[PDB]
Amino acid sequence: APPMKDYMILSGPQKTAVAVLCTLLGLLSALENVAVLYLILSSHQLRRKPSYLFIGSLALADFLASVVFACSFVNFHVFHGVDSKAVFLLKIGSVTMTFTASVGSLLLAAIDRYLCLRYPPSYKALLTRGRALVLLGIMWVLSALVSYLPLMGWTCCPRPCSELFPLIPNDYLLSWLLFIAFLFSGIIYTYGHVLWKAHQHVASNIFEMLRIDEGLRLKIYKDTEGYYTIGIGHLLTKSPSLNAAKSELDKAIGRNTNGVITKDEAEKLFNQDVDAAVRGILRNAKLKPVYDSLDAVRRAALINMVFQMGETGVAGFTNSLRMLQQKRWDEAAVNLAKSRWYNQTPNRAKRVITTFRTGTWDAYARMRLDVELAKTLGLVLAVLLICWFPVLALMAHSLATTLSDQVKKAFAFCSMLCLINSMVNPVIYALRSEEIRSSAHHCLAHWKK
Numbered sequence: 111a112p113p114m115k116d117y118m119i120l121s122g123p124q125k126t127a128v129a130v131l132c133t134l135l136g137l138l139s140a141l142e143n144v145a146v147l148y149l150i151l152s153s154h155q156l157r158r159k160p161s162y163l164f165i166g167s168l169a170l171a172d173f174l175a176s177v178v179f180a181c182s183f184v185n186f187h188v189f190h191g192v193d194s195k196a197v198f199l200l201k202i203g204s205v206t207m208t209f210t211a212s213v214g215s216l217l218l219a220a221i222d223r224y225l226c227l228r229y230p231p232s233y234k235a236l237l238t239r240g241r242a243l244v245l246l247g248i249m250w251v252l253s254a255l256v257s258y259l260p261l262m263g264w265t266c267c268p269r270p271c272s273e274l275f276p277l278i279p280n281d282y283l284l285s286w287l288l289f290i291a292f293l294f295s296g297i298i299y300t301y302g303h304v305l306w307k308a309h310q311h312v313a314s315n316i317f318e319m320l321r322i323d324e325g326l327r328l329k330i331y332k333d334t335e336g337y338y339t340i341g342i343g344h345l346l347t348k349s350p351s352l353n354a355a356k357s358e359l360d361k362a363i364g365r366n367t368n369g370v371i372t373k374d375e376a377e378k379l380f381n382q383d384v385d386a387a388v389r390g391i392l393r394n395a396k397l398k399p400v401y402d403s404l405d406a407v408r409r410a411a412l413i414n415m416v417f418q419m420g421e422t423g424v425a426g427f428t429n430s431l432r433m434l435q436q437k438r439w440d441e442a443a444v445n446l447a448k449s450r451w452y453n454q455t456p457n458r459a460k461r462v463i464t465t466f467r468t469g470t471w472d473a474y475a476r477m478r479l480d481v482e483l484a485k486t487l488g489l490v491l492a493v494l495l496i497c498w499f500p501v502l503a504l505m506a507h508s509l510a511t512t513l514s515d516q517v518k519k520a521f522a523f524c525s526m527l528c529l530i531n532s533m534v535n536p537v538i539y540a541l542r543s544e545e546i547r548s549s550a551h552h553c554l555a556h557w558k559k
């Protein structure tokens with residue numbers, strides 16, 4: 111067995127550079143993750159959701175790693191940690207376990223999203239707060255079984271020893287890398303289908319946009335003012351009679367409907383309504399030059415305002431209408447927010463204003479906080495695969511050919527990428543997830559007062 115002093119590679123002032131770097135990154139990583147743990151455990155809305163308990167497990171795995179990895183690195187490489195066989199095996203085992211549980215935590219987070227977006231009503235019956243905690247229990251245990259295997263007697267006694275890690279053999283190293291490669295393929299396969307479904311949820315039409323705002327109904331209904339209406343906001347009559355509304359319906363369709371229409375018949379009526387909206391805008395002196403400047407997505411947002419308050423009402427935002435034409439999306443957003451339209455109907459106005467600001471369909475989606483979480487996980491997975499790749503690629507090269515002293519020096523500094531990855535994650539979750547964003551605002555109220 112080769113002594114631990116042979117792996118202790120450092121060259122004077124270059125060791126003091128890692129001593130300040132590893133300490134500062136390790137302190138920042140631990141403080142960023144412990145905030146994410148507090149925020150989830152403190153907020154009533156988060157702790158009860160099985161989706162946020164998997165995120166919490168990633169924050170725990172990253173926090174335990176940050177502390178173990180930095181204290182074991184600065185002790186081994188900088189201060190020269192003369193550790194005995196038993197003490198060293200549990201240290202290397204603790205490092206492996208806290209890292210394996212992160213990959214595991216991600217895999218469960220990716221299957222949680224697939225079941226939610228693929229089978230929506232069956233998810234509440236399947237994933238429960240208790241059932242999630244049990245599933246998180248099996249994972250942490252399996253992680254400890256795989257990682258603590260050299261401590262059980264799988265060390266390099268007659269078998270060839272590894273280049274980078276003391277006491278661990280190449281047959282174990284190859285087995286752990288192959289296991290991690292299979293977990294990554296499993297995450298990729300699921301996230302491949304997750305994207306496909308998450309995409310089918312967001313609107314890509316005016317019909318799909320106005321379905322969220324007006325509400326598609328195939329039987330006669332009453333609006334906020336009380337008028338008899340059908341389909342996607344199609345007005346039947348201005349009188350209080352149902353028979354008058356029924357007669358107007360049979361004339362509009364061309365057959366005896368009896369108060370019930372087909373989806374294809376509802377879309378045919380909607381296409382006649384859109385044509386009349388656009389022809390109206392063209393014959394309005396104020397609305398015509400604005401419709402001409404706006405793009406296809408933004409035009410659908412102005413048609414939406416016409417369906418809600420008519421042509422005479424939309425022409426009343428003289429200062430906003432000019433800001434929109436001049437392509438000053440930011441100055442018009444604040445100008446339209448100070449309107450009574452925003453005061454009366456906040457949700458409809460907020461969704462319309464954001465479309466005029468971004469030029470996307472992103473505000474219009476069924477289960478949008480569930481779709482946006484699937485969008486956040488994808489960015490977390492991408493950063494993981496970027497940061498771990500050079501570290502993993504060197505370990506695979508470690509099995510193929512004998513490594514030089516200078517290459518071993520590169521790996522010590524290279525492994526610092528595992529510490530930046532853990533620092534990038536709590537910034538993404540605090541900037542993209544709205545539920546983590548609002549939980550931090552409600553917690554600061556109790557901290558200050």
Ligand SMILES: Cc1c(C(=O)N[C@]23C[C@H]4C[C@H](C[C@H](C4)C2)C3)nn(CCCCCO)c1-c1ccccc1
Pocket residue numbers: 179182183186187201202205206209275278283286498501502525528
């Ligand atoms: C970057 C890294 C390390 C790592 O640097 N471990 C050290 C363990 C110990 C000796 C020495 C200095 C300090 C204390 C860190 C190496 N350990 N692992 C766990 C995999 C080892 C498998 C053999 O048991 C990693 C690592 C983390 C993420 C992906 C790939 C490797």
